[PDB]
């Protein structure tokens, strides 16, 4: 049995971007309420419960490259 | 058995912009509620209760290459 | 038994975009809400229950290339 | 047995823009509502219940290639 | 057996930007409350309660490569 | 007396091929038989005498482009 | 006498190729016979006698681009 | 007299290749046979008498760019 | 007299390539044979006599550029 | 009288190879037989008598970039 893995790659994920600009987050104010009572949770849990997120995320490129490679034998 | 694997990659993913411009994220504030009691979670769960989400994104570019290789034998 | 396998890409996944220019999003905040009592959830269980989502995304090309090989035997 | 796997791939996807322009964005609020009781999910479920839902998605290009390729034995 | 695994990545991520400019993130303040009593958390449990999250994350590039390689026997 | 020579060019000579194939040269052996006694070159004498040339040329594109600009006085 | 040469070359040549195959070349081989005297080069003789080639040219694009600039009082 | 000689060039002369594959130069040997008595070369002379080549050139691109710039009184 | 010589050169010669592949150089071996009697060489001359070579050349791209810029008086 | 010369140079000359392979020379061996009297050569002569060259180049990339600057009066 011969196994010859050698797969090539040359490529490539890019931007290019002049200026981003003004970018303004400003949205009102909620609210959020949760009235649970009981959580019990276990073996592999993940949990949000009851939350305000404000993000602003403005990255001069965020480009991904994501890449897996598997031999199993 | 002979096994040969030699794929190869010469792509690309690519963006080009001027100026993204002003952006603007203003959203009446909203109201979330969630009247739940027991919340009894396992073995493998993800779980997002009651939640208010402002999200803003604006990447440069924001290309995504994803690639999987897999030789099972 | 002989398997050879060698495929090759030279592809391309691109765009331009001269600006994107002014983006507006400004909902009128909305309510939302729920009135469960019970939630057990158990082995690969995916839940989102009570959300209220302002999502804004400008990406300056949001190209995406997604590529599997899978060789078995 | 010979088998010889070699596809060849230099095609490309996509796209030129000169301006997106003005975009807005501005439904007014509306309202959801769950009344339900028991929701108890397992073995493999995705679930969302109760939701408000503003988004806003606006790629300066937004091509997607997905390619699979297969070889089994 | 002979098995040889030689992947040969020559690739890049990148990213150019002008300038990024001049972001504002201004949500109004919210509230944020939850009313449970008991949270028994164990075994693998990843969990948040009642937050309020306030992010500006502006990254001069926040290009991303993540590269796994995998051979078992 | 102006002259302003300023030509703008902006062209492209360019070719895309899958695969090149399977080549085979394989011409008979001949004989190249040259007699003669005196041989008197002067003054930009380019020349060839007595050859035999087997030649394979297969580029992945041979694309040529030529240019003369010439200006007189 | 004002003259201002100032010609614009933004042009492009260029090729993509998959693959370059199977090239074989497998001639047979030859016979060169060259008999003279008396060889008398004077003033610039450039000559080749007497000769045998086999040439492989196989190269990954063999784009040319030539140019010549020539400007006289 | 006024000459501004100013050419400008931004070109490109580009190639992309997968795979230069298996490239075969098996020509059967020969044979040159040169006589002669008197060789009299004087005066730049450049020559080749009696000779036998076997080449294999296999570049991965092999692009050329040739340019020449002359100006004269 | 006024000449201002300044030309402007951005150009670019590339190549990528994933393999160079196999390449098999096995010419059978040849023979050459030169007679004479007298060389009278002289000035500047150049000269190759009863030669035989063997060239394998395989660069991961042989791009060249080449340039002349002459002016005069 | 006034020159500047100036030449403004900002080009590239690359390649990339993720690999340069298998490369095999292996001619048959040769003879090359000579036989003269006399060699006269006086005042710049250059020349090569009787040889056998087996010559393997594989560079990692061989770019080249040649340039000749001359200004005379």
Same mark, same amino acid.
Do not use: A, M
């Given at each position: 049995?011969?196994?010859?893995?050698?797969?090539?790659?040359?490529?490539? &994920?890019? *931007? $290019?971007? %002049? @200026? !981003?600009? /003004? =970018?303004? #987050?400003?949205?009102? +104010?909620?609210?959020?309420?949760?009235?649970?009572?009981?959580?019990?949770?276990?073996?592999? &849990?993940? *949990? $949000?419960? %009851? @939350? !305000?997120? /404000? =993000?602003? #995320?403005?990255?001069? +490129?965020?480009?991904?490259?994501?890449?897996?490679?598997?031999?199993?034998?």
């Amino acid at each position: 049995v011969q196994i010859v893995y050698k797969p090539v790659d040359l490529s490539k &994920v890019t *931007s $290019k971007c %002049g @200026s !981003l600009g /003004n =970018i303004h #987050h400003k949205p009102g +104010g909620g609210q959020v309420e949760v009235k649970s009572e009981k959580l019990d949770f276990k073996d592999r &849990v993940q *949990s $949000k419960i %009851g @939350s !305000l997120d /404000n =993000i602003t #995320h403005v990255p001069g +490129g965020g480009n991904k490259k994501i890449e897996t490679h598997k031999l199993t034998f």
